[PDB]
Amino acid sequence: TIPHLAIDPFSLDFFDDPYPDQQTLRDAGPVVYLDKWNVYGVARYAEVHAVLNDPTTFCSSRGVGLSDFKKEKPWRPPSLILEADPPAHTRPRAVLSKVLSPATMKTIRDGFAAAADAKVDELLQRGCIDAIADLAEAYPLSVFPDAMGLKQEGREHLLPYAGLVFNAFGPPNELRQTAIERSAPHQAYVNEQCQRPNLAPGGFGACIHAFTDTGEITPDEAPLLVRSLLSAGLDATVNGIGAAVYCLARFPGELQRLRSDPTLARNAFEEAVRFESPVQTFFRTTTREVELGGAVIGEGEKVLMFLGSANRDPRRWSDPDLYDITRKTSGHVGFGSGVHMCVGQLVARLEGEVMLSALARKVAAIDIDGPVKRRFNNTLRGLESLPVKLTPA
Ligand code: HEM
Ligand SMILES: COc1ccc(C(=O)O)cc1
Ligand SMILES: [Cl-]
């Protein structure tokens, strides 16, 4: 009843162009079995959304990568938020929600926007730049570590650590093995910065520690919650912003609409998140036998959710393969859905909005003008190099 497919959704050939295989995955049925890794897969919007919103059966506490924490040792101590279920999830979630709250965004908006404006003006003086290293990486690097309250020394470990975290959700392929082997210096750096004395008063890290006073988290929980922000908080936005610039570069008509109304910046970013889905996949593990899409899945089985595929499913989206900055994006699963829906989404959207706003106001054209190189990661979709010429407005 369930179709078996040999597609390896973690192969380099798949990463290079996932779209035909994602259609095959959707069209084979609502639920598939992936023989390469012995996991179930869901690739249509309806089932991906349903699984995300069914945490009592499709749990996160046994890991959201391929590895089942009941069977294997986690490569690092479990995330108190990503890799926890309610009720254990609830209070640490509330702390991060408050630390990255709407009220908090007020305190960082002027600086984040100023930094985006300045970066775009700087890039316009150069003309011919790499939209990854010089923009998608450089901009979040210029604002997020500071907002975290990180010291200067050691920041070169941030992106490598994140790449490791995202590769480690994958199967034990070469990407994962290479990421984990020797990773100790990256881990040592991040773990050290999670300790209270290393975090600047006022920053996100210190604010997490401040919540230990309230009874919501204990002092020994705080470093792991800071670790969560240092895991997801930089690399995901790098790939979100890179996705947005790549979209604007490929769809000049949409760059022109954005220029004509810069207030579309926020939705232009949200649409980039749907269109590229920088975070491609997460797993769940069944806590019990469960029927899904007419398919009976046993207990303790890994289920792979294709978020990127769900975000391009023609059953749900009109012209899913088009970048449309005025699309009604609500309901997309690029930030997840339900109890684990991205707790850093206000920070992500703030960064994306203010960068797209700066481009909207200052740039007339974005032309790809050199070889484009893809970056391969078991979880992240994005580019390694995106040479572009920026034409000033
Ligand atoms: C465009 C950028 C981003 C994307 C596409 C993204 C994507 C996601 C997704 C899909 C999830 C759901 C995980 C699941 O259901 O298992 C998630 C959760 C999470 N994200 Fe984001 N993220 C982004 C930016 C950020 C930022 C900026 C931060 C922190 C500053 C962050 C921190 C987190 C954390 C801590 C969770 C776990 C929440 C929970 O388990 O309750 N992310 N993110
Ligand atoms: C969305 O990707 C991540 C990655 C790591 C974590 C974490 O370490 O808690 C959360 C979200
Ligand atoms: Cl770590």
Automatic annotation (TrEMBL):
InterPro entries listed in its UniProt record: Cyt_P450, Cyt_P450_B, Cyt_P450_CS, Cyt_P450_sf
Protein name: Cytochrome P450
Keywords associated with the record: Heme, Iron, Metal-binding, Monooxygenase, Oxidoreductase
Required co-factors: heme
PANTHER family linked to this entry: CYTOCHROME P450 YJIB-RELATED (PTHR46696:SF1), P450, PUTATIVE (EUROFUNG)-RELATED (PTHR46696)
Signal sequence, start to end: none
Any GO molecular function: oxidoreductase activity, acting on paired donors, with incorporation or reduction of molecular oxygen
Similarity annotation: Belongs to the cytochrome P450 family.
Keyword Heme: yes
Domain of life, source organism: Bacteria
Family annotation (Pfam families): p450 (PF00067)
List of residues binding heme b: 89, 93, 284, 340, 342
